[PDB]
Every structure is written in C-alpha cells, then in structure tokens.
Amino acid sequence: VDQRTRDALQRSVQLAIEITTNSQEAAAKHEAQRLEQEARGRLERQKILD
Amino acid sequence: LAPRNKTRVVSYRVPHNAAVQVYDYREKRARVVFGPELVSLGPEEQFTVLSLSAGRPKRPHARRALCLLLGPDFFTDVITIETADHARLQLQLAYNWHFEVNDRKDPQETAKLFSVPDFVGDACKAIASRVRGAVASVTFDDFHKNSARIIRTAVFGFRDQAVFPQNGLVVSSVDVQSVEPVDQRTRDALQRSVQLAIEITTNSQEAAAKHEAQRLEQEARGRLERQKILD
Amino acid sequence: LAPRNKTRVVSYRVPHNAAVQVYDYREKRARVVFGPELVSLGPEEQFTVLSLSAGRPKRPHARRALCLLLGPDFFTDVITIETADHARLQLQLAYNWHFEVNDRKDPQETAKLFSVPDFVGDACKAIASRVRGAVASVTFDDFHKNSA
Numbered sequence: 001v002d003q004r005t006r007d008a009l010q011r012s013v014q015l016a017i018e019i020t021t022n023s024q025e026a027a028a029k030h031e032a033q034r035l036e037q038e039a040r041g042r043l044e045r046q047k048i049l050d
Numbered sequence: 051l052a053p054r055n056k057t058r059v060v061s062y063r064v065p066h067n068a069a070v071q072v073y074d075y076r077e078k079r080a081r082v083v084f085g086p087e088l089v090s091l092g093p094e095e096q097f098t099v100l101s102l103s104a105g106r107p108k109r110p111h112a113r114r115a116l117c118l119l120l121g122p123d124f125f126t127d128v129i130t131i132e133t134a135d136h137a138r139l140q141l142q143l144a145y146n147w148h149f150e151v152n153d154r155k156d157p158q159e160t161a162k163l164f165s166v167p168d169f170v171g172d173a174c175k176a177i178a179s180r181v182r183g184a185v186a187s188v189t190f191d192d193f194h195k196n197s198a199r200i201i202r203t204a205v206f207g208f209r210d211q212a213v214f215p216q217n218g219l220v221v222s223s224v225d226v227q228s229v230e231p232v233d234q235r236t237r238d239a240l241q242r243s244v245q246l247a248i249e250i251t252t253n254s255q256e257a258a259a260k261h262e263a264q265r266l267e268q269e270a271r272g273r274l275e276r277q278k279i280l281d
Numbered sequence: 282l283a284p285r286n287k288t289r290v291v292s293y294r295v296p297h298n299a300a301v302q303v304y305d306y307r308e309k310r311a312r313v314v315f316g317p318e319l320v321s322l323g324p325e326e327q328f329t330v331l332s333l334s335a336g337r338p339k340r341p342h343a344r345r346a347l348c349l350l351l352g353p354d355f356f357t358d359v360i361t362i363e364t365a366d367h368a369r370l371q372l373q374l375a376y377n378w379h380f381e382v383n384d385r386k387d388p389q390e391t392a393k394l395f396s397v398p399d400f401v402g403d404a405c406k407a408i409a410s411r412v413r414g415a416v417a418s419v420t421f422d423d424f425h426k427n428s429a
C-alpha cells in the first residue's frame with residue numbers, strides 16, 4: 001500500500017542488480033587476473049628458455 | 051446493418067474447431083454441437099453466451115461470444131509479477147491451449163467445456179498465480195539467466211500439460227516473449243550491466259592481444275639475442 | 282472494383298501449394314482441397330478464413346485469407362530478446378517452414394492443418410519463446426561469437 005514500502009523494495013532491486021553486476025565484474029576481473037598470471041608464467045618460462 | 055427477420059429460424063454457422071451449446075428449454079435438453087454444422091434453434095433453443103476475457107491486460111468481461119473454440123489457439127496476457135529481490139517486472143506468456151475432448155458424443159463431457167463461464171480469464175489467473183508464486187521464490191539473476199525452466203516446469207511442474215479438470219482445458223508449453231522490467235531504474239541498471247559486460251569483453255580482448263604481443267616480442271627478442279651471440 | 286454477381290457459384294482458384302478448407306454446412310461434411318483445382322462452393326459451402334499474422338513485428342490479426350500455403354515459404358519476424366548480461370538486442374529469423382502432409386486424401390490429417398487459426402503467429406511465438414529462453418542463459422561474448 002505505502003509508497004515508502006514500494007520504494008524500499010525498489011532500492012532493493014538496485015542492491016540486487018548492483019551486487020549481480022558487481023559479482024559479474026569481480027568474476028571477469030578474477031578470470032582476467034588468472035589469464036594474466038598464466039600468460040606471465042608462460043612468458044617467464046619462455047624467457048628462461050630464451 | 052440490415053434488420054434480421056424475426057420469423058426465420060436463427061441459424062449460426064459453427065466453425066470446425068468452435069463449439070456452441072444450445073439449451074432446448076421446451077424439453078429441458080441441453081445439447082452441444084461442433085463441426086462444420088450450422089445449428090438451427092428450435093422454438094425455444096437458446097445459445098450459451100460466454101462473457102469471455104480479451105485484450106492485453108485481460109479484462110474480465112469482453113469478447114462476449116456464442117461459440118467456444120477447442121482448437122490449439124493461444125492468448126497473450128501481460129502479468130506484472132515481483133521477484134525475490136523486490137524488482138517487479140511485467141512479462142508475457144503465449145498460453146498455448148486446446149480443449150481435450152475424450153468423446154465427442156457424450157452428453158456430459160462435451161457439455162463440461164461450458165462449465166466455467168470465462169475460460170480465458172480462469173486459465174489466465176490460474177497460470178498467473180503459478181507464475182507469481184514460482185518467480186517470487188527465486189532471485190533476479192536465476193530468473194534472468196534461466197527464464198524458461200522455472201516458468202514452464204513450474205507453471206506445469208512435475209508433465210508438459212496444464213490440465214484443467216473443470217472444463218477439460220489443457221495448456222501446452224508457454225512461450226515468453228518479454229521479461230522487461232517495469233521500472234526505468236531496473237531497466238537502467240541492467241543497461242549499465244551491458245557495458246560492464248561489453249567493457250570486460252573488450253578488456254579481455256585487449257589483454258589477450260597484449261599478452262600475445264608480449265609473447266611475440268619476447269620470442270623475437272630471444273631470437274635477436276641468440277643471433278647477436280652467434281654474430 | 283466491379284460488383285460480383287450473387288447468383289454465380291463462388292469459385293476460388295487454389296494455387297498448387299495453397300490449401301483451402303470448405304465447410305459444406307448442408308451435410309456437415311468438411312473437405313479440404315489443394316492443387317491446381319478451383320474449388321466451387323455449393324449452396325452452403327463456406328471458406329475457412331484464416332486471420333493470420335503479417336508484418337515485421339508480427340501483429341496478431343492481419344492478412345486474413347482463405348488459402349493456406351503448404352510450400353516451403355518463410356516469414357521474417359523481429360524479436361527483441363535479452364542476453365545474460367542484461368544487454369537487450371533485437372534480431373531477425375528467417376523461419377523456413379512447410380506443412381508436412383503424410384497423406385493428401387485423409388479427411389483428418391489434411392484437415393489438421395487448419396487446427397490453429399493463426400499458424401504464423403503461433404509458429405512465431407513458439408520459436409520466439411525458445412530463442413529468448415536459450416539466449417538469456419548465455420553471455421554476450423558467447424552469443425556474438427557463436428550466434429548460429
């Protein structure tokens with residue numbers, strides 16, 4: 001009934017879609033860090049071989 | 051436009067999938083006929099008018115009509131439901147339906163299709179309550195990713211047929227065509243998400259190109275130092 | 282332009298891939314005929330008008346028509362779907378379709394093609410729901426790379 005209760009539930013949407021896109025961004029950052037670490041390890045192994 | 055003749059027998063041409071039930075009030079015999087046949091009223095036979103539901107938001111009293119189609123049609127209804135994260139969103143279902151008649155010459159089963167007066171409103175609310183009860187228990191991410199299993203195996207959860215034993219109406223698989231949110235704030239935070247998704251996509255592409263360029267530069271540098279040692 | 286003669290028998294020239302179902306209301310016999318034949322209505326035979334779907338965004342009531350083509354045609358429909366990264370995008374499908382008739386002289390199977398009144402709207406929504414349900418579960422990169 002209340003527009004205050006219909007606004008706090010709205011604020012909740014954002015806190016839900018905000019933590020959803022934050023989890024997506026954090027998972028993308030962790031995958032990018034893992035790929036960067038793998039590429040860096042391959043680069044240092046190839047530099048030691050060179 | 052032209053006024054009808056009151057003397058002539060009232061004849062209604064029933065289509066092959068539609069069905070009309072006539073009440074012969076003189077002998078209190080109710081018969082329902084379907085097929086290519088045009089039904090002819092007697093001295094006191096009267097049609098069964100069905101105040102159905104029509105339109106997009108499914109108004110409860112519209113499309114009044116003598117016939118009742120039993121063929122595989124579909125009615126599209128917008129339903130505004132709320133998820134478990136209090137992000138309300140309006141969505142559409144196709145509602146593929148057909149009346150399943152086991153025997154077409156049975157005075158009781160063929161007249162059972164005219165039990166509920168508004169089968170389009172009843173089949174919309176009975177499938178709107180299920181959708182609202184099944185989506186409000188799951189979050190926005192699980193509903194936006196998997197929007198079809200929890201609306202089809204939930205609307206008619208374990209079987210693929212949503213039978214209605216009041217009138218014999220079955221409902222086939224429901225085909226969603228929009229899961230668009232109501233709020234423009236929710237339609238903007240999902241947009242911001244596009245960029246964070248296309249931004250991390252082009253960042254992964256740029257990082258992979260940079261790592262491949264660094265690997266090729268290191269290989270060329272190692273070949274250059276080996277050739278310089280040989281020189 | 283010219284007004285038709287109400288006396289003359291209503292004849293409709295059916296094309297080789299189209300199909301018309303006529304309801305002989307006088308004997309309650311429904312027959313559906315296809316081929317090069319022009320069908321002639323009797324004293325009470327009436328055509329099966331199909332309120333189909335037409336246009337790009339596939340409006341549900343347009344192109345009303347007596348015939349029903351069974352040949353390998355295609356309808357193009359724009360569908361606006363959302364990916365798993367909340368990046369909604371509108372896309373088009375060709376929808377190559379044809380009616381598969383196992384036997385062309387069967388009173389039941391040949392009349393089964395006129396069961397759904399709007400086969401173009403039903404075949405668009407049934408294929409739009411599948412596309413929206415299959416693309417919303419996969420991300421933008423996997424959909425833009427492997428879109429087929």
Ligand SMILES: Nc1ncnc2c1ncn2[C@@H]1O[C@H](COP(=O)(O)OP(=O)(O)OC[C@H]2O[C@@H](O)[C@H](O)[C@@H]2O)[C@@H](O)[C@H]1O
Pocket residue numbers: 102103104105106113114115116117118119123124125126127170332341342398399402
């Ligand atoms: N006189 C009637 N008697 C029995 N059933 C009817 C009648 N009129 C409509 N119905 C059923 O109720 C449904 C109500 O549909 P609407 O909400 O009016 O139209 P919509 O839901 O936007 O789309 C339905 C679509 O399905 C096709 O059958 C039809 O060509 C239409 O485009 C119809 O699809 C039809 O199957």
Ligand SMILES: Nc1ncnc2c1ncn2[C@@H]1O[C@H](COP(=O)(O)OP(=O)(O)OC[C@H]2O[C@@H](O)[C@H](O)[C@@H]2O)[C@@H](O)[C@H]1O
Pocket residue numbers: 333334335336337344345346347348349350354355356357358401
């Ligand atoms: N009277 C009819 N009876 C039966 N089927 C029909 C009828 N009219 C159209 N159809 C089918 O429904 C489809 C609806 O098509 P539209 O949306 O009107 O046109 P579009 O989807 O833009 O393109 C279809 C294209 O396919 C070709 O068959 C046709 O030449 C057209 O260019 C048609 O392609 C046709 O196969």
